[model samples]
Target: STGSATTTPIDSLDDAYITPVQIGTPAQTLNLDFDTGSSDLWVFSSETTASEVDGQTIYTPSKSTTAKLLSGATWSISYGDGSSSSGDVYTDTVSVGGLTVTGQAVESAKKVSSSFTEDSTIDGLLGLAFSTLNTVSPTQQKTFFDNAKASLDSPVFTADLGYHAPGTYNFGFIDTTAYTGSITYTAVSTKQGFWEWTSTGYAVGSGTFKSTSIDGIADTGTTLLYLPATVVSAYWAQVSGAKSSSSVGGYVFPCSATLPSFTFGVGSARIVIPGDYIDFGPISTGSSSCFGGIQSSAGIGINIFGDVALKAAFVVFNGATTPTLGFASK
Candidate 1:
């Protein structure tokens, strides 16, 4: 079986891509962030305290005949940004786009941090990362994709994330028309449960490509791009007034500075991220300094090729026995 779903940005920053996911018996549709950086399909539900609930949709297991409690089971997951959520577990019929998976573990959030509660647009997160990252305790749970792959025409799913525009996520088979040029295959290291891959080199705008090996993960769950401090510093150097500022929390530059394009090589192919993407947006509402979309991964430990890079290509997360990643221009 194959399926497709629309991926729309939750807000102006292209922060998180919201996709419609239906959970439970009568089909309660909620906006979920299709996260490739983490595993565990969790939702804000009736189990959540009223104080933590805002305008977000809450899944009600009591109303669903197919819902069944997973006795004594629980889950908790922390993120890179430090925001977190924890809750009990239940199994129910979950559907994404038109793909249906019965007995899908639906983590019901009983507690959430202010970061999640303040954001009303996101009802929950649907993890697409490797099941090895599943946070369920005692008995681990498979992600929706993991369970759906059993009947998929192919054992691969594709992410065609766009820049400030709606995109699509496809399950089962790759849509040949979604990208241009040829798809370059790269070995993935799901060792840490990320769709991690190695890039041979990178280039700043039209400058010569630096022959440096870099390892990073394709994370649609994130908004900015992160690289080694050296690489990040090199890119920012091209801009006239770019500098790191602790008060603002990331590298920032004069809004009028001429930002250059960035390129990362996959096999022999170079996918380019335009200069505009590098300028995330103004730091303040009307401020002149703009925060960079590409930041140093110094403290981050692992380099993350988040939406800023994913938007530059059509990515395929192959979940076959020997998991691999495919990249191409779009």
Candidate 2:
């Protein structure tokens, strides 16, 4: 089977995209952030503390007749800042973009951090990363993608991200009309539990591409593109009045700077990210300086080909006998 769903951009900065999903017997719909970087399908729920609920929609497992407790299972996703959300697990019917997967592990958050509470646009995160990274204790659960792959027409999914408009996330089958030319396929490394791949090279604006390899993950969850500090520094050097400021934690440039486009290689294919995409936004409402969408990954320990990069191309995550990632122009 195959399915497709439209994803809506949220926040003034297009920080995240959310798609509606049906859960339980009668199907209580909740708009969830489909994250490809992490692997825990957790959500805000009736079990979540009232203080942490804010304006997000919560899933009430008690109201779903088909929901069943997983007995002794539990999950916890922790961040570097000590921010975390941990909870119990339940198995129930879940329909994502019309693709139904029953007996899916739905982690109901009993406690969430303040960072999650401040974001009203996201109710939960539906992870698409390899199930091996799942944070569940004792018995790890298979992801929706993994469970549905066998029943799907094709064991693949594609994400066609948009600028400020709606984008589509298609499951099982590739839409030939969604892209231009043929897709360039590359090997993927699942050793890290992410859709990780190696980029052949990169170029700043119209400059010559420097032949090198950069290993990174295509994460639908992250908000910005993070590359090696040297690569990021080289790009900023081309812009006038651009400098790194630890105060704000990244490079900033004048709002009027003629920001250059960024190009990365996937095998022999070159994916160009427009200049406007790099000019994220002004630091403040009336500030003359703006932040760059491409940030340094110096200390992060991993390069992330986040939303900014993914939005520029039609991405395919193939999970058949061998895992491969494909990119094509949209």
Candidate 3:
């Protein structure tokens, strides 16, 4: 019930950060990451300098003949990974699904950083992952959800992230048809852009948590759940006498023993984390290198329940109306 298709905004129609709404007359499709973590829509544009345009997909206005620039206001963006890009601004009629929002905010960044330069599949990021940190307009920067809250069919927006690879990222109304069972809601703390809750502890094998416990933030941006290293090590010790492998990522362990199911405690909610979810992509350390899905980030600011934990459930971000969160069965 964590990862649901909640109503968020399509900040950019071009970049990979926000949910890409198809543009260009007939509409060349694009998938944007509709993040509430930051605010901004960046797309590769024709104005991008040759050197900056390497490895990125720039939208050539000449190709569409209908695309237009947003004056000559220059734009650049920096990420947490210490990567950045510089370019100009553009305003064009963008389409998402059957909706059309014209003169939308768009950035044409050049001089990209290595993080983006190396990723061939990712052209640009739509900073819906809300925070004061940003590359575009700062003073009054609101995420795409803030701008399009009125257009959504429901005040409740949900995000159903991908499971193994890429899955259908839907929005608008809560389509109960997509889910198989009843819906459930978990009270959360809206600290920053993340939907955080108090997690008391975790249980392996059995997908259940302790009562009156606390957890960290649930985020779609990250791929793995970062827990306290000490806590995970202790938990694994009980499960399979397994210890963190230093030769491996350390989070990985040799589990010749049958590991039990894991559950996280969040107040009254005893959420479970199945073993299958714990094993992420295969590692080269060995054909059986066990990549622990949950890693230790004891000093990390917050614990993130990444896409893996999210995809298992239908999560609702009550931004448009209630400012509350609810999870549903899938």
TM-score of each: 0.98, 0.98, 0.77
Clashes of 3: 53
If ranked by lDDT, best first, what sequence of candidates would result?
Answer: 1, 2, 3
Model 1: runs farther than 4 Å from truth?
none
Model 3 is weakest, by summed lDDT over 10 consecutive residues, at 6-15
- In terms of TM-score, the best-performing candidate is 1
1-330: candidate 1 lDDT, tens digit per residue: 998999999888788889999999998998999999999999999999899999999999999999999999999999999999999999999988798999999999999999999999999999999999999998999999999998999999999998889999999999999999899999999889999999988999999999888999999898899999999999999999999999999899999988899999898889999998787788989999999999999999999999999999999999999999999998
Model 1 TM-score, 2 decimals:
0.98
What is the TM-score of candidate 2? Answer: 0.98
Tens-place lDDT digits, model 2, residues 1-330:
988999988865668899898889889888888888988888899999999999999899999999999999999998533568999999999998889999999999999999889988899989999999999989999898998999999999999988877899999999999999889999999998999999999999999999899999999988789999999999999999999989977999999899999999999999999988787788878999999999998888899998899999999999988899999987
- lDDT by residue for model 3 over 1-330, one digit each (tens)? 111222232221111223556546556555455544445666666665666555555666556645665554666665433667777665555555555555556666656776666655555655544434445543334444545556666644566654443444444567677565555565666556556666656665643443434466666655566776655775566555355766775566553544555676543444555566666433563456556766776656667766546666666667643365555546
lDDT (Cα, 0-100) at 305 in candidate 1: 94
- Name model 3 segments beyond 4 Å from true: 1-20, 24-26, 47-56, 61-86, 130-134, 187-191, 199-201, 212-215, 238-242, 245-250, 255-260, 265-267, 285-288
lDDT of each: 0.93, 0.91, 0.56
Model 2, runs deviating above 4 Å: 79-83
lDDT, candidate 1, at 86: 97
Using TM-score as the measure, name the better of candidate 1 and candidate 2.
1
Q: Give the Cα error of residue 61 in candidate 2, in Å.
A: 0.6
